[PDB]
Design a protein around this ligand. Structure first.
Ligand SMILES: Nc1ncnc2c1ncn2[C@@H]1O[C@H](COP(=O)(O)OP(=O)(O)O)[C@@H](O)[C@H]1O
Ligand SMILES: Nc1ncnc2c1ncn2[C@@H]1O[C@H](COP(=O)(O)OP(=O)(O)O)[C@@H](O)[C@H]1O
Ligand SMILES: Nc1ncnc2c1ncn2[C@@H]1O[C@H](COP(=O)(O)OP(=O)(O)O)[C@@H](O)[C@H]1O
Ligand SMILES: [Mg+2]
Ligand SMILES: [Mg+2]
Ligand SMILES: [Mg+2]
Lengths: 527, 526, 533, 66
């Protein structure tokens, strides 16, 4: 039948209306699955992998990755959502919902004989108008702690339990404010997300310092040093071999002893430099040295350091070099050729924590750390994973809010206002693209619909109530998730990231326009 | 025992069946992408056997992703690849033209005309088409940026990037202009090596831009180095900055107590000597295609120098062209001229969750990178393909400033000219000449069909218009299905693209018309 | 009209082996059923009258025990909800040490009553809110139910009485003797410094003479032998070495380069003389016991035998560290003679045979030391393993007592009092959450019900008696195990008390697990595929 | 994070370098004697890799693409 099948007999081809129907069905299925995720009233999903790992989540992107899907259009939507998560860290579920609703509304007119090109033109015009309105509606405002708290709550409440969200809001906002420099881009690598598995979920907190997942490797090391100098180094204190195949030659046992003793002089020189620095810095027992080394330390050097009362750690992470130099305030050293007291970090408390077979080291009471750690506690692995995803979303939301002082009212109020603006702008559009503009507005209207449906209220009645209130009053009224009545999102404290909304509009419109114009799907690589 | 002259798996097909099969295969290959031509073309989804998805309406990608068995289809796909590589545009046009010429040749082959007569007529028609195409061309002032932007626009109105036309046109024009180079009396463009396209999913498409420099996905080796340098002095290297084994076997034999420590100290001193040799030029940035040792990092850091390691050779060449540096593989031979001054800013910033290194304020850079921001990977891939088409068209115009009316005007004018020329042959070969002359109408017909208007009425009106005297520029408005004068619509294409398309299609027909016997199944015997 | 096609949308896009469950009946009710099944499997091993279960894992290794955590870990549970409940039980085991069966039973009862509440009309959110409110109320009430405190941990009798209850559920027949052993072992450990280390109590399992022949040794026992000829030291002077008892060698590569005949002739003599000098230097410090963590050279062994030095070789570094802790030595890295502060001391080291296994004993005369060991006897490996599990439970109970000294009455008294108080509170609360609060209160009855069922009496009569008695106000009254008729008695006089911290953590973890299971609404399982481990 | 294969992604993108004519396909053997007389023949210096499969069973298309 098809030309491709004429060339490649075992080729799968969907042509003309078939390809569009296939794409729309896939988008509708994805939207049907992801509808229940939207809003704090959404339902958790349990995802079990092949090996039996359990993951509880509500994140749209996480759900898309763990969904057992084998469809091309679903793959494209998943890639779009992955990009949205990577850049902004929020709006993945909204992304999928808007794409699916756009495709459904477009099909509603295409099935009436309309060419998809006109619908795409209407989509482009509506996207331009909606972007203009979004620029007109955002609330530019210098952000103190209150607005950041509100944004973090608006994200974490949708991601986790209410009390856990309350704790995580303070954690994330305090961490961001701690690591934020004035008029400088925020580096999220400087916040360490370490997870321990012993306490309850509400015991997770923020440490104004650093937490390491390894401890001292010598049993005679001090377990808690009160006042500490931090020596952040990247020098291999363990034994090393010559690059040029050295070998040893001797003629007697005494010569063997001499060679054995003389083979560790190179490392002992570095160890002696460290010991001399420690003795010069502190001659009393009041203070102490913590030596965090990115490279290993052989047991001989560990013993030599421990005899001098120096606690040392080996095989630290690469990012921990910057984390310690910013928190404690020292200088990371790749050699000990010229080491001075001014290259030493400071820490008002360093102690070691044991949990089962795992070992942890806390570096606390820093003067004014520029890199903090977010300690995650929970009784389950899946609880830790959920909290980690929620904290990632909250950190991204707070950073996005800080990036541009504008913030957008949430609860679907901006979607309703944009829908009304597009409807009013529709007469200005020339031609049959008015149908595409109307479809775009109806697709934008999905967010309040899904929010009301998840909250358990009637969809259409709640939507018409919201629209009537907004039309008669002109305010940015959203969907209340406890009563269903119209509510002013700005006054209540439901905030949305402006960058998230702009990225949603751009990506959804682009991908929907590209999909609508596809008229053939081919798989002709076999044979 | 089945004794045979040839092997069992050898199968031989011969006769008019072979010609019919070849022509039908070419027709079907044309029909694959017949609908992907014109400003109203519809995109296609290709499922890569490696698992990826390719969404495009470019002819070459679609035909490349298809696996076929009939070797005539393989010939057509190779034709598409050749047209793409030579000029970068007109892939669908050349495929459709080859199919149409083979159809009108099969017409005569069904009668008692030998294929060689058709070949001779086709070659004569090719000469006449080249002559007419050169005749109806117009010159272009390359200095006028408006005309160049209009040409690139006409080249990109048929792609998905057409919605952002001014942005894409400016990006392509700036990239092509600043990659243009001239040395030793030789002029070159080299879009392939320099003028890199780096795509980062996310953001918005309007944020895409061409940088006055090179951007790489690399970070500083040590966090203590500067991530923002105002006017860097860049030094590029190939050799590693670490102690390495010699070429020959160089085993040592230690019999004294202090030889081990001396060996290790000598290693350290050699690293320090290399770093001092680098420092002697007082640079700010050191880029190495290979590793940089931790001790080397320390010694560079003590001199307040930012170091980046493990960079691809192509990226290092691009950086050298952008900042005007020379790669040196031996630091002891580093010269002042080798130090790269000309970069106006170096800055490492975080995009998303991954660090990127920018050298993006070069004065007079001969290499550039194009930063693409988009919805996802497939959208950005299609955008990059469209940008490649735009850059290829721009370089073709820069090499040859001749333009030809587009949107079917050139094909109709050439068809009319050849039809008029055929009136004075009075030979048996005039019929194939006329047939291949009017076979060029498939391009306006395809434009009308994709637009949606009536093919027969519009095509007849266009032919009647072209029968007049000064109407060579009358084509089809592919968006509204009406006849317009393309000196008013403004659609123009480089003469090189049209010439290459016509030549390739005619010679594809010639090559596939010389075949009347197919044997297959024999081993490679390699 | 002969086949029902898959519905368009997600149903068609699903993978081959994947499974999708959505809604109440398909997901929540089924999870509740699975958790109830798990609780049913573990139920019968609760209380003193619990029954051991022979469990054989995939490796064809036999486990017989009534420890809920061990039974759960020896069963390859497949259902994800039961997996979550098992994770909660294991977390309770890690945090406290005892109470895993309580966690599992409470979670099962809570989920069953949640299923009933969902059936009668309530919503999942209402049930979860009600359970959270009731759990907060129970945690508020629990401190007021404390009957007494440990008030002394250096005493043997008091610690034995405190530890008897913990190790009465396991090994019910003979708990006094095990209590005395564990009390002595824990009192030897736990110095004037308040910190107590559970790992400092070692267990050695030597088969043959019945568990009543077990004893406590102030030191360590290693199932090894002595390399040298000396097998008894009375004034031990252990000198621990982490290096092999041999001349050290170069780390890169060492070759003996001989260029003349005299060097070839004298090499072996010089090497042996150096070895003898090193060993004699070690011996001249008064050391008579040498413990090495590496191999023993033949010449080194000969020269050690010449100077009457006991050789003990420890294969595992953990044993070396434990011996250093229990003796007072420092693990030297070279064959240098030990200095006085690094000089290890012990009261007696000897080679002895217990049953048919040779052991090396490091015995301290004083009733003190860093590490104490329990030599367990028995007629079966599995029996000794059960005694070891009971010992672990008792030691964890002692550690909890060190952390928190409060105790609450056991035997269902605390559960009945909690249920009564929470039910009384739930009446005062209006709204729909009162049903969830009342069901949370009723879920506490599964503990006295399990105890009565295992003891062989009618659970309903016992529960009614407990409610009556707690209605007058005797809040320290639980069921009497030693009775063939349903009866109750005061637990304070009987000394049947369990740690307050254990109850607190167990209730918290069980409630959290039940709530987390309830929160799940959809399940998307993937194809099991392989996963060998 | 070298344990997480930093270069895996970039190797994936520049593995999409078909460049030349088409991309060909793996040799399909339809006779056991064909397998035997192709493994017996051909120079032994270079390595020969063979894939065994049955149509329909999962875990095949990914291998063929690889
Ligand atoms: N307390 C609230 N009341 C009303 N609306 C809310 C509230 N919290 C969040 N929302 C709205 O519900 C939506 C939640 O989206 P979410 O589930 O986070 O999707 P995604 O994860 O894709 O961003 C947001 O768009 C926000 O405007
Ligand atoms: N707006 C337009 N109206 C009419 N014809 C057009 C228009 N834009 C481009 N064309 C014609 O379409 C042809 C380009 O088709 P295209 O899809 O680019 O095929 P290819 O990719 O093979 O070059 C050119 O011959 C050009 O003359
Ligand atoms: N002598 C006894 N009489 C009555 N109840 C007892 C007695 N000893 C222990 N119990 C009860 O048995 C329970 C312990 O059961 P057990 O098998 O240890 O489960 P878990 O290990 O989960 O605590 C405690 O709640 C305690 O009240
Ligand atoms: Mg969100
Ligand atoms: Mg083109
Ligand atoms: Mg117990």
């Amino acid at each position: 039948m098809a030309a491709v099948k004429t060339l490649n007999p075992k080729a799968e081809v969907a042509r003309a209306q078939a390809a569009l129907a296939v794409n729309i069905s896939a988008a509708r299925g994805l939207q049907d699955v992801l509808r229940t995720n939207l809003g704090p009233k959404g339902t958790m999903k349990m995802l079990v992998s092949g090996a039996g790992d359990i993951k509880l989540t509500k994140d749209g992107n996480v759900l898309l990755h763990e969904m057992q899907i084998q469809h091309p259009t679903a793959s494209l939507i998943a890639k779009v959502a992955t990009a949205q998560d990577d850049i902004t860290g929020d709006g993945t579920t909204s992304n999928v919902l808007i794409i699916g609703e756009l495709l459904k509304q477009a099909d509603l007119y295409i099935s009436e004989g309309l060419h998809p090109r006109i619908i795409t033109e209407g989509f482009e015009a509506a996207k331009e108008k909606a972007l203009q309105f979004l620029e007109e509606v955002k609330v530019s405002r210098e952000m103190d702690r209150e607005t950041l708290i509100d944004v973090a709550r608006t994200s974490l409440r949708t991601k986790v339990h209410a009390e856990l969200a309350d704790v995580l809001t303070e954690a994330v906002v305090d961490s961001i404010l701690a690591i934020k420099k004035q008029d400088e881009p925020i580096d999220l690598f400087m916040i360490e997300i370490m997870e321990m598995k012993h306490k309850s979920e509400t015991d997770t907190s923020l440490i104004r310092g650093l937490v390491l997942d390894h401890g001292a490797r010598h049993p005679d090391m001090k377990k808690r040093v009160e006042d500490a100098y931090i020596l952040t180094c990247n020098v291999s204190l363990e034994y090393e071999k010559t690059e040029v195949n050295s070998g040893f030659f001797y003629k007697s046992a005494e010569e063997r002893e001499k060679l054995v003793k003389a083979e560790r002089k190179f490392i002992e020189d570095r160890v002696k430099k460290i010991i001399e620095l420690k003795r010069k810095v502190c001659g009393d027992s009041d203070k102490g040295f913590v030596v965090i080394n990115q490279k290993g330390i052989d047991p001989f050097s560990l013993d030599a350091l421990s005899k001098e009362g120096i606690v040392a750690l080996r095989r630290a992470k690469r990012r921990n070099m910057e984390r310690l130099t910013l928190a404690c305030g020292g200088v990371a050293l790749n050699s000990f050729d010229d080491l001075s007291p001014d290259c030493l970090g400071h820490a008002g408390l360093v102690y070691e924590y044991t949990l089962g077979e795992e070992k942890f080291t806390f570096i606390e009471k820093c003067n004014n750390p520029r890199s903090v750690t977010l300690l995650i506690k929970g009784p389950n692995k899946h609880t830790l994973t959920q909290i980690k995803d929620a904290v990632r979303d909250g950190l991204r939301a707070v950073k996005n809010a800080i990036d541009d002082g504008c913030v957008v009212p949430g609860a679907g109020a901006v979607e309703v206002a944009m829908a009304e603006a597009l409807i009013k702008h529709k007469p200005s559009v020339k031609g049959r693209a008015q149908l595409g503009v109307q479809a775009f507005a109806d697709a934008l209207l999905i967010i309040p619909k899904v929010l009301a449906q998840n909250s358990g209220f009637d969809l259409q009645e709640t939507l018409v109530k919201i629209q009537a209130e907004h039309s008669e009053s002109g305010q940015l009224v959203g969907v209340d998730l406890n009563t269903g009545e119209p509510m002013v999102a700005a006054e209540v404290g439901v905030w949305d990231n402006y960058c998230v909304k702009k990225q949603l509009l751009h990506s959804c419109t682009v991908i929907a326009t590209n999909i609508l114009l596809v008229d053939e799907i081919m798989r002709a690589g076999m044979s | 025992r089945p004794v045979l002259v040839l092997s069992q798996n050898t199968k031989r097909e011969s006769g008019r069946k072979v010609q019919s099969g070849n022509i039908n295969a070419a027709k079907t290959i044309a029909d694959i992408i017949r609908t992907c031509l014109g400003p109203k073309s519809m995109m296609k989804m290709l499922l890569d056997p490696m698992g990826g998805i390719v969404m495009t309406n470019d002819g070459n990608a679609i035909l490349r992703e298809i696996q076929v068995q009939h070797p005539a289809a393989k010939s057509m796909i190779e034709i598409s690849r050749t047209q793409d590589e030579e000029v970068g545009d007109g892939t669908t046009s050349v495929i459709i033209l080859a199919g149409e010429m083979l159809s009108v040749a099969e017409h005569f082959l069904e009668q008692q005309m030998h294929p060689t007569v058709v070949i001779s007529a086709y070659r004569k028609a090719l000469d006449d088409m080249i002559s007419t195409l050169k005749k109806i061309s117009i010159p272009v002032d390359i200095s006028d940026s408006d005309m160049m932007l209009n040409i690139i626009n006409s080249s990109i109105t048929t792609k998905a990037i057409s919605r952002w036309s001014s942005l894409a046109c400016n990006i392509a024009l700036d990239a092509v202009k600043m990659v243009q180079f001239e040395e030793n009396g030789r002029k070159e463009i080299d879009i392939k090596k320099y003028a890199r396209v780096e795509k980062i999913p996310g953001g918005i498409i309007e944020d895409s831009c061409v940088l006055r420099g090179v951007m790489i996905n690399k970070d500083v080796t040590h966090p203590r180095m500067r991530r923002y340098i105002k006017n860097p002095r860049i030094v590029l290297l190939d050799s590693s900055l670490e102690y390495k084994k010699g070429e020959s076997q160089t085993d040592i034999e230690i019999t004294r107590e202090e030889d081990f420590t001396r060996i290790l100290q000598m290693e350290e001193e050699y690293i320090q000597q290399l770093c001092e040799d680098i420092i002697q030029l007082k640079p700010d940035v050191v880029i190495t295609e290979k590793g940089i040792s931790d001790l080397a990092q320390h010694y560079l850091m003590r001199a307040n120098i930012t170091a980046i390691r493990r960079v691809r050779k192509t990226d290092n060449n691009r950086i050298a062209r952008a900042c005007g540096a020379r790669i040196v593989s031996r630091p002891e031979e580093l010269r002042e001229d080798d130090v790269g001054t000309g970069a106006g800013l170096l800055e490492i910033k975080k995009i998303g969750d991954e660090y990127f290194t920018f050298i993006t304020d070069c004065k007079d850079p001969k290499a550039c990178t194009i930063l693409l921001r988009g919805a996802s990977k497939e959208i950005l891939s299609e955008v990059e393909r469209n940008l490649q088409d735009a850059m290829q068209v721009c370089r073709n115009v820069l090499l040859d400033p001749q333009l030809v009316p587009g949107g079917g005007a050139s094909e109709m004018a050439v068809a009319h000219a050849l039809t008029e020329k055929s009136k004075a042959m009075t030979g048996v070969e005039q019929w194939p000449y006329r047939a291949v002359a009017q076979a060029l109408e498939v391009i306006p017909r395809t434009l009308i069909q994709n637009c949606g208007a009536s093919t027969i009425r519009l095509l007849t009106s266009l032919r009647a218009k072209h029968t007049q005297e000064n109407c060579e520029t009358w084509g089809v408005n592919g968006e509204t299905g009406t006849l317009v004068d393309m000196k008013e619509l403004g659609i123009w294409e480089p003469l090189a693209v049209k010439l290459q398309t016509y030549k390739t299609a005619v010679e594809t027909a010639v090559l596939l018309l010389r075949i009347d016997d197919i044997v297959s199944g024999h081993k490679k015997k390699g | 009209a002969l086949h029902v096609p898959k519905a368009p949308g997600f149903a068609q896009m699903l993978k081959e082996g994947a499974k999708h469950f959505s809604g109440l009946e398909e997901a929540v009710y089924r999870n509740i059923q699975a958790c109830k099944e798990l609780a049913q499997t573990t139920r019968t091993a609760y209380g003193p009258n619990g029954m051991n279960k022979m469990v054989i894992n995939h490796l064809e290794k036999l486990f017989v025990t009534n420890d809920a955590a061990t039974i759960l870990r020896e069963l390859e549970v497949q259902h994800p909800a039961a997996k979550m409940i098992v994770m909660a039980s294991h977390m309770q085991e890690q945090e406290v040490g005892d109470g895993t069966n309580f966690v599992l039973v409470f979670a099962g009862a809570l989920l069953e009553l949640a299923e009933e509440l969902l059936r009668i009309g309530l919503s999942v959110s209402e049930v979860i809110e009600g359970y959270e409110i009731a759990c907060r109320k129970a945690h508020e009430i629990l401190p007021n139910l404390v009957c007494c405190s440990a008030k002394n941990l250096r005493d043997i009798d008091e610690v034995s009485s405190l530890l008897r209850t913990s190790i009465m559920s396991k090994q019910y027949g003979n708990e006094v003797f095990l209590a005395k052993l564990i009390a002595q072992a824990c009192v030897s450990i736990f110095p004037d410094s308040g910190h107590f280390n559970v790992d400092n109590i070692r267990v050695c399992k030597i088969l043959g003479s019945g568990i009543s022949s077990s004893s406590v040794l102030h030191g360590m026992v290693f199932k090894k032998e002595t390399e040298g000829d000396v097998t008894s030291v009375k004034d031990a002077k252990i000198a621990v070495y982490s290096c092999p008892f041999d001349g050290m060698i170069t780390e890169t590569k060492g070759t003996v380069l001989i260029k003349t005949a005299e060097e070839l002739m004298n090499f072996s003599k010089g090497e042996e003389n150096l070895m003898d000098a090193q060993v004699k230097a070690i011996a001249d410090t008064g050391a008579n016991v040498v413990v090495t963590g590496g191999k023993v050279a033949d010449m080194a062994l000969h020269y050690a035998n010449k100077y009457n030095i006991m050789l003990v070789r420890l294969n595992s570094k953990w044993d070396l560290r434990r011996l250093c802790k229990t003796v007072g030595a420092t693990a030297l890295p070279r064959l240098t003679p030990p200095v006085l502060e690094e000089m290890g001391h012990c009261d007696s080291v000897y080679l002895s045979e217990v049953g048919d296994t040779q052991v090396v004993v490091f015995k301290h005369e004083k009733e003190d030391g860093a590490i104490s060991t329990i030599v367990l006897r028995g007629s079966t490996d599995n029996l000794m393993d059960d005694i070891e599990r009971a010992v672990d439970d008792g030691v964890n109970t002692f550690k909890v007592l060190t952390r928190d000294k409060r105790l609450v009455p056991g035997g269902g008294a605390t559960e009945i009092e909690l249920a009564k108080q929470i039910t009384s509170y739930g009446e005062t609360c209006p709204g729909l959450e009162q049903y969830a609060i009342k069901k949370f209160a009723e879920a506490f009855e599964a503990i006295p019900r399990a105890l009565a069922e295992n003891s062989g009496v009618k659970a309903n009569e016992v529960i009614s008696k407990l409610y009556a008695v707690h209605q007058e106000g005797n809040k320290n009254v639980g069921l009497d195990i030693e009775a063939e008729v349903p009866a109750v008695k005061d637990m304070l006089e009987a000394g049947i008390l369990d740690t307050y911290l254990g109850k607190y953590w167990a209730i918290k973890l069980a409630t959290n697990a039940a709530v987390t299971v309830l929160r799940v609404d959809q399940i998307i399982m993937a194809k099991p595929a392989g996963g060998p481990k | 994070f070298l344990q997480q294969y930093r270069k895996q992604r970039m190797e994936e993108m520049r593995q999409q370098l078909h460049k030349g004519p088409q991309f060909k396909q793996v040799f399909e053997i339809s006779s056991g004697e064909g397998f035997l007389d192709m493994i017996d023949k051909e120079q032994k210096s270079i390595v020969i890799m063979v894939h065994i499969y049955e149509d329909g069973i999962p875990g095949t298309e990914a291998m063929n693409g690889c």
